[PDB]
Design a protein around this ligand. Structure first.
Ligand SMILES: [Cl-]
Lengths: 166, 166
């Protein structure tokens, strides 16, 4: 189920991450990268590389912090994926959640409909696979940490999701 | 599901087609447009418009002939959809099959992995909502009509799909 740009196709550095998540997962945390937006497969693969680069090389994480990334190209970029604990929401939320990040800054722009679809589609895929609970809950990054993430314009949107829980 | 770009989002003219498909549908025919290629959402939306516009204004059809279109942006473009008989494989095949078209000429080029993924994902999303049959059969366009569609290279690939039938 789902179309996902695999690690190898956005030319990801090999993962060093080992800590597994306990399936099915109850919580999804939605962030923004607060970085550059991109609207083409070519530019969005490059941006996935840039986010992973910042996390592995500068913050010294085992991989890109996010389980999945969303491009404005309307594609899902594989991060740690469904089975591996992420680094996106702190030490209380990272063990019990999937972290999906919209590549961009959504303080003043909304992500386009294709990106919102790609994200909702991904989560349904999670349920279908048994990676997420049928009764999964969606959180803002700001609901679980002191942050503007995932941006006012995007936060306002995810609040209207059927699985949103403050 | 399956993260399909809706009619309205690619600035489609309204359909005037009435003839429903008898679901669950048994066949999938795979064509190329033999038209211009596109690899950005902006360009691929303009290309679906261009194909629809030819079918409607020039050939006088009720809508774009294809049930679905596949861009090299890795997105699926809603044509006539799951429920409306197409105009893509001729009258033997139009009322019993779903038509999906790769936007481009694939005689001497291959479509990218994300276009092929998008296609496969679309088919599983058909099964899933009951539009296609669990055990559907994929046919080449050149396998049901005197045409080179869907191109030498793309025809070689669909040949190796699990569900492919010669
Ligand atoms: Cl017609």
């Amino acid at each position: 189920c789902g179309s996902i740009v695999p690690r190898r196709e956005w030319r990801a550095l090999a993962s060093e991450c080992r800590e597994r998540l306990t399936r099915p997962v109850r919580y999804v945390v939605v962030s923004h990268t607060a970085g550059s937006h991109c609207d083409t497969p070519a530019s969005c693969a490059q941006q996935a590389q840039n986010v992973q680069s910042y996390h592995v090389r500068n913050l010294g994480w085992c991989d890109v912090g996010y389980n999945f990334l969303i491009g404005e190209d309307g594609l899902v970029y594989e991060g740690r994926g469904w089975n591996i604990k992420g680094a996106h929401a702190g030490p209380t939320w990272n063990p019990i959640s999937i972290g999906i990040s919209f590549m961009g800054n959504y303080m003043n722009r909304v992500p386009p409909p294709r990106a919102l679809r790609a994200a909702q589609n991904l989560l349904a895929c999670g349920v279908a696979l048994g990676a997420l609970r049928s009764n999964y809950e969606v959180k803002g990054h700001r609901d679980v940490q002191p942050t503007l993430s995932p941006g006012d314009r995007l936060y306002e949107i995810i609040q209207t999701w059927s699985h949103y829980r403050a």
